[PDB]
């Protein structure tokens, strides 16, 4: 994954897821279953074993990483460019879609695609989360919680598609 | 618990259970829830935290213990005698009922009772399980599976009330 | 018645214690040478106180303590709350009677019950009586010997459970 | 066509380778011285093979290897199975086309897709072609250079996935 | 015055112481037985011484000690020197009165002050009185009971601080 | 101190302071010286040686403690009550004033006082700082920075005199 | 550085220186410133862271090294000869000046220069210090203090330019 | 061987055887011787030484291995195929007979044979034992005892020549 | 035983022885047875278981101990004196016979006896062996082999009854 | 011784011485022777053985102690006073003469004397050595070598009888 | 040386030777121276320174080695044959004389000689010692002491020139 351990891881585990069944298986037996997813849821348980876880974490897939203050998602990014990737929230998941073409060896022709979804552990706030893209094609998720903490309340809104710090 | 670790534990965780719610819581946020229980079933997722787991394990109450080949249940047995306790199967649980009277300090008069139920992690066979009583009043459950293993299939039948090896 | 018565028982216491030384120481015383022786015782017053022884005592059925600083009946209560018990003094003796519901294991459901009497000595101030759950999880029914000078009178009364612990 | 063509691419291859030485060685041649120168180549044949360168180439999207013992196109497949791919040779070039479902993270659901072409050299025996998942988790589409001596003819055919690995 | 016165215171011482034982031882014584018581014482013387218781015482405000070998009022002085204190005996009681400047933390400036009285028993020889800073950093104001024999008379005098420690 | 270591410590150282011278011385030679204080500032340087430183921391005096998110100040609080103590800001310091009278041994008469000042390390915000008092008489400083961080900008305002969490 | 440780270283631381412023730055915040130178111175413171320281140490530059009895300064001496270097005291520093020409590769023409100043720690006597040159172009500072020790008093005088022991 | 240780071884030783012688030787011385063988036986013783033882084990020969539940016999199987080997019981031993022809280097002509006998420890049942053959030509003995245990009673019967799990 | 171881031881074883048966037982089954013884022888085877061885060783009985160069036999020698014990060779054994009377507690009258035989391991020479008695009643066997070694040839002859080195 | 060683021682041785022878022785054988012584021486050678040486040282006797820069001689000084002891050099030894009378238990009458000689290791200068006496009656030798070192040349002169630092 | 140681050585130383111167130277110073030678011786012383021683040982030379029971001397034996070397006793030393011619590289003409003397540690008997020569030209000294031990008494006699065990 890486991140750390604890505590976170656990958370991661938781996120992862639961259912159981797965867881149951592982364990054993037982029973059953459961729871679932839704968102819220997340849861756890733890585981580891698964595978898924591984894938988540790492393986293939990619990778996940978890702290108290943030959960970070690092990708296994064979070349897509920063322009090909898109970020949005759906169903307590961070959604990613992409399409890229690349040159190789003894003449090929390549199309390359993916569509990813990643949950956040219960200490993570989905509404507050933001998600950004580095130059390798590597998404790395630093989404402000202003500092650390708890917020479980969440449900969807749109995230800015931004070039990344990490 | 003891037993072991692983594996078981886881199983244990598973078992435990888951538901878721618880788981858721723990877990966280888420969502839811669941599943349941039943049995079968069980589961888861794981856790631990719761408590329950613790209780379971251990504590109180008494105590639980788990292996692959058996699950063993050891009691916090302030004096009842071996005659006061009863063993049977009900709803993927080992049932125990008791009543005892004892002398103390600056004249009291005592009645003492309990009614216990314990699930088995599904790697345990409830139909094959047997349960026995030692001299301290301590139930300790060694119930033949002939050796180790899997049997999930179970539903109730009567267990012999036997004085124990452990 | 108381014283013477016481013684027876116481014785137981013584026885153991025885030785011586213790016683012485206590017482013172011484021684012787031778060688040886034885132881012682016373018545018035017584012683018781111481405690140681108580413890031881405890044993079972109990454990008891009662020093120079207070007079007490400790009862092994770790399955129960003090609220499932109600305490009354009748025919120069304390009667503590308890009946509690089934407590969850993630496995199943487990109750106890008791009907207890212990004689409080001529030395206890029964109008001071209170009902507490102690550090061991034993219910401490206490009428304090607030001063080490002897023989504050025993008499009948009913006690609703106000948490004393202590 | 193939051759021449191739160349352119191749160239680438050459360138680276260239140186020379380577071429020378291868071639051888030578140277121158111067210072320076340148370278170478061739045509016829071519160369391629070587592988180384491839590886470187890879660057992304891949990694390629193709030695004296065999000709191969490795593809970075760790998200996919070889069964989600179907391989056919068309207009003196290998076309590997893959589309897979979403794989579970305990978090969520993640797919990829690709539409790939790579040119196989005049030196590959295309009637020998097989489809395997390698040790790296890369799909190795191989027509063997069973003997080191040069230039077995390329031609079109469709390949159902029979697991080759290897 | 012283014585017675013383016582018242012482017572315281016683118371515691018371117891016783112581016382016884011382014384021685024883015781018673018764129961108781118381214581013782014485016156014259016384015782015182022882010491143981014191220691316891201490318681615071102080800690006090006074044995068979000497009679003492210990005072918790660790912020102060014995030179910031001046000691006088008035109306069969010792009056230790202290007022000190601010001591540096690398952070800032911190003072204390006190106006103290402590009755010395009929058994202290007050013409022997000395003023010391002890091992704990407590000011030990002592008139010795150089022999394990009873009741060397109390009377008024003013004491400039000559370092006694001891 | 504690807291932691680293880173914181350184811061702490620073804060411390320176011047130178012282330184120178130591140283040587040379030269010278220076420067111064003022506030702003702080510074430184460283140383150791011185012493112062020691004181601061701791010593005494009392005690200090430091983290990134807060600096905590724990006192050596022989009995003053929660009513006798006062909290305010002066010159990048937390000011404290107090007066208390207490019963002792073989009849004394006691007055007891203090006046404290404590700097904050520069990663601490003095304007945002609050400072609170527990039941032992122990001031413990938890002052919202909403979460962790930097703010050096500070100059004085009044802090609420509140009963404490820690 | 070386030387040683212690012691020285421381020283060284111282030285170184212171112023513061430076220281412051480292430291933181705060304041411032211162112182111165012168020388013386030285112173211281321590531281370481620055660068310066470284440078110082080381570176470049060069390197520093520190003991109680001497501070030694080792240089990153790409070829200068023993004749090109000069030693004197200025402003609690050892001064060094140089100019050398060297043959290289595919015809170059080289001039090479440096002008260094090095402080001594407070434990070091600048007036007593001497500084010498080995065959590699490496200055190494062994300057009699007759044995070990303290002398802080220093201000300038001329050092003999001697070929070195170390 | 391986196986284981124990227990077984022882067983083984035983088995072885024884014888012784042888043883013785060884032883020584012484014584012787023885025883033887037869069977039964076984035884033882133881041883160783022887040778034888060685052879056984191982050586050649081959190799042996022992557990409570089974004894496993692994062979040093330069190429015979699975068809060339035969399994039977004789005199508390597992019998094996074989004949194979193979191509080598600068033209040879090869015949290759063996005739083996292996005892079992007294914990092992010879009547219940079965013995199977893997693809390398490696006999590996897993013979049901249904689970673990004791049976020493044994005397011969025919074993199925089966392709192996291990 | 011782010785040584070886070687020885073885030886020882051886010785021882063887036878066877024883052885067978232880062883088982087877067968047877044876052878033886013788010786030679020884042887062885071885064882241880046885026882024886133881015883041887030781125881018672007594005790044994083994080396290459000698085998040493230490007794559990409740009071016999050095005069009551006898040493001779019979059937690759060291023979011991005894009778003693002793005063005790609230008037008894005592007779006390024993008759012992001890084999030597193979690497021991029985013809060369000597055996001696210490002040506690403890026989300790140091019998010259002029140094270490092998001699297995042995059959009986008389040993000097000597007071011992160990 | 112481010181230282070386160187020284050686030285020481040386010283021582030578021678041778012684030485031778121682130684052886051869041868022778121677140478021576012377011184120178020383030477040486160485041784131782022786014784011586022782013584030386120481023884016684007393005690010795060694370093590079000094050799220190500590005495087992049951009460002589500082006035009863004398220090001088004879034959690469430090000479000591004494006579004291002391009160004891159930009326005795005591005279107490000694006459000591102590060599110095080769690294020590006897002409430069000085030797001093502390309040316990404990001679402790700190004799200036201005700092550390070698001086072997020595033959006698008078040492000042001084009260000591150590 | 070787051987051884011781013882031886021482021885050785021784030986050686011584012377012274030477021684012285160484030583120183011183012174011276012475012684021577012778022987014886030885011685021683021781130483160583020376150278020587160385040478011784060783140276050239060769080498030495030491035990209680024998001292062994191993030579750095570039090719001499076993026929070229001679063994005798002179002045508590083992004497060795030799002359050999050997082919080399781009036509040389070689004569090669040595004359050695080796002391024995005092626990060695020179009269009982024997010394032997292995195939590499390596003298290795095993000289009967029938077993281990002490004999210091020695003065010269002739040793058999024997081919060696070690």
From Swiss-Prot, chains A, B, C, D, E, F, G, H, I, J, K:
GO terms for biological process, alphabetical: actin filament organization; apoptotic process involved in morphogenesis; embryonic camera-type eye morphogenesis; lens development in camera-type eye; lens fiber cell morphogenesis; microtubule-based process; mitochondrion organization; negative regulation of apoptotic process
GO CC, any one term: nucleus
UniProt subunit comment: Heteropolymer composed of three CRYAA and one CRYAB subunits. Inter-subunit bridging via zinc ions enhances stability, which is crucial as there is no protein turn over in the lens. Can also form homodimers and homotetramers (dimers of dimers) which serve as the building blocks of homooligomers. Within homooligomers, the zinc-binding motif is created from residues of 3 different molecules. His-100 and Glu-102 from one molecule are ligands of the zinc ion, and His-107 and His-154 residues from additional molecules complete the site with tetrahedral coordination geometry.
Cysteine pairs bridged by disulfides in the record: 131-142
Pfam families: Crystallin, HSP20
Residue positions where N6-acetyllysine is found in the record: 70, 99
Effect of residue 139 to P: In CTRCT9; results in protein aggregation in the cytoplasm
Positions with a binding annotation for Zn(2+) 3: 154
Alphabetical list of InterPro entries matching this protein: A-crystallin/Hsp20_dom, Alpha-crystallin/HSP_16, Alpha-crystallin/sHSP_animal, Alpha-crystallin_N, HSP20-like_chaperone
Phenotype when changing residue 123 to D: Impairs chaperone activity
Protein's organism: Homo sapiens
Tissue note: Expressed in the eye lens (at protein level).
Family statement: Belongs to the small heat shock protein (HSP20) family.
GN (gene name): CRYAA
Positions that bind Zn(2+) 2: 107
Deamidated asparagine carried by residues: 101, 123
SUPFAM superfamilies: HSP20-like chaperones
Domain sHSP: 52-164
Location of Deamidated glutamine modifications: 6, 50, 90, 147
Residues recorded as bearing N-acetylmethionine in the entry: 1
Effect on the protein upon substituting residue 12 to L: In CTRCT9; reduces protein solubility
UniProt binding sites for Zn(2+) 1: 100, 102
Protein name: Alpha-crystallin A chain
Effect noted on mutating residue 54 to C: In CTRCT9; uncertain significance
GO molecular function, one term: identical protein binding
Post-translational changes noted in the entry: O-glycosylated; contains N-acetylglucosamine side chains. Deamidation of Asn-101 in lens occurs mostly during the first 30 years of age, followed by a small additional amount of deamidation (approximately 5%) during the next approximately 38 years, resulting in a maximum of approximately 50% deamidation during the lifetime of the individual.
Site (Susceptible to oxidation): 1, 18, 34, 138
